[PDB]
Amino acid sequence: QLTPTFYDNSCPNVSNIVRDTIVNELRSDPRIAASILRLHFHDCFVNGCDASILLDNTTSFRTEKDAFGNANSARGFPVIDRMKAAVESACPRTVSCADLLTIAAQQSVTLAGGPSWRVPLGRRDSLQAFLDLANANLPAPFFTLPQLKDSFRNVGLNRSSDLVALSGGHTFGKNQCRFIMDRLYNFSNTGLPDPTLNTTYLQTLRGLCPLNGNLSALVDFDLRTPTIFDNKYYVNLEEQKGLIQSDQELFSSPNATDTIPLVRSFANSTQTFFNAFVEAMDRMGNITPLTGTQGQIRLNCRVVNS
Ligand code: HEM
Ligand SMILES: [Ca+2]
Ligand SMILES: [Ca+2]
């Protein structure tokens, strides 16, 4: 069983070391908090939160970093290396990369203005990476609501609250133009923009992502508060201003009878959202963890111990 007090004796300063690292990095890279939270999400959705995503290539298995959902998208790996080295210095061979990334995600959310809580700990590190599983399990921005629900249920999150609350991770961070081009110019081969995208916002996004323009150009997920972790993400959805298809579908999909009330509840109360986010975050962090003597306490998050 995972427990928040796992390192209270062996490494009481772990959370503070992680926090210090992120604070330092945020000065030169204001996007790092968002990037780190996403790394935890992509770790947990592939064989559970086992730091499998942090492993680099080997001749026996491919890295998840080359998965369609990670390649030229996932970032912040050097920052994780930095905090790992710092923690290893303070507490040698004690904190797993899986737990380190979980704490990093929570601290990132808190630093960006989100809720503060102690995450369950005790996870251990994988002995391999899963590229095929990552390609199959990570959801995509073009997924319909039923597909999004399927993707979450596939890894163990059955609740619509899990989906709606965790999607709130898009209250900050960046998104490449490539992922919304269809919504802006030719959605579902209709030759027209996605009708669920506010027409005023449509104009703005078209200006940032012109047809035949730089597809790697970055756009803010939350037009209200781009770098602050708050419930503004849901207020946007209510106004048809969700950035990607998967965001807006939570409010506009024909299958959103169960998600619409959740979107409204989170937009109406920061407390309601934050409570649900913590609840969902801990549920995601509890996905098929390796515990006890299973797996290892990786010394270098990029490679399995030898
Ligand atoms: C529900 C399905 C989801 C889909 C389809 C999805 C899709 C995406 C896409 C397309 C990007 C842009 C990547 C890029 O342009 O490089 C992204 C970024 C991001 N996502 Fe999600 N996401 C989902 C759920 C989540 C969840 C559950 C979290 C975390 C709790 C999360 C946190 C983030 C953050 C913070 C970023 C910004 C990262 C950065 O700026 O470096 N996402 N997501
Ligand atoms: Ca994983
Ligand atoms: Ca925000």
**Looking at ligand 1, which residue's alpha carbon is closest to its atom 37?**
173
| Of 117, 85, 110, the residue nearest 33 (C-alpha) | 110
Q: How far is CA 183 from CA 7, 169, 195, 203, 219, in A?
A: 46, 21, 8, 12, 14
Judge whether 171 is annotated as a binding position: yes
| Contact 175 CB / ligand 1 (< 6 Å) | yes
Q: Which CATH class is domain 139-284?
A: mainly alpha
19, 38, 42, 123: the active-site residue? 42
* Domains of the chain, residue spans: 2-138+285-305, 139-284
Residue 209, judged by CB atoms within 10 A of its CB (0-12, 13-18, 19+), counts as: buried
Distances, alpha carbon 12 to alpha carbons 22, 24, 122, 184, 297, in Å: 18, 20, 14, 49, 17
User: Smallest Cα–Cα separation from 178: which of 34, 76, 69?
Assistant: 69
Query: If we measure between CA atoms, which residue out of 63, 60, 62 comes closest to residue 77?
Result: 63
User: Using an 8 Å Cβ cutoff, are 266 and 170 in contact?
Assistant: no
**Rounded CA separation 180/182 (Å):** 5
Nearest to 84 by CA among 299, 289, 297, 296: 299
52 annotated ligand-binding residue? yes
241 lines ligand 1 (CB under 6 A): no
Closest to 288 in 3D by CA, of 42, 49, 41, 1: 49
Burial of residue 186 (number of CB atoms within 10 Å: 0-12, 13-18, 19+):
middle
Structure-solving method: X-ray
Give the whole-angstrom CA distance, residue 305 versus residue 219.
Answer: 39
Cβ–Cβ under 8 Å, residues 37 and 74: no
Atom of ligand 1 nearest to the CA of 72: 16
CATH architecture for residues 2-138+285-305: Orthogonal Bundle (1.10)
- Check if 174 has its Cβ closer than 6 Å to any atom of ligand 1: yes
Give yes or no: 42 in active site.
Answer: yes
Query: Does 225 appear as a known binding residue?
Result: yes
CA distance 228 to 34: 10
38 lines ligand 1 (CB under 6 A): yes
CA-nearest of 237, 227, 225 to 164 is: 237
Q: Is it true that 2-138+285-305 and 139-284 share their CATH fold? A: no
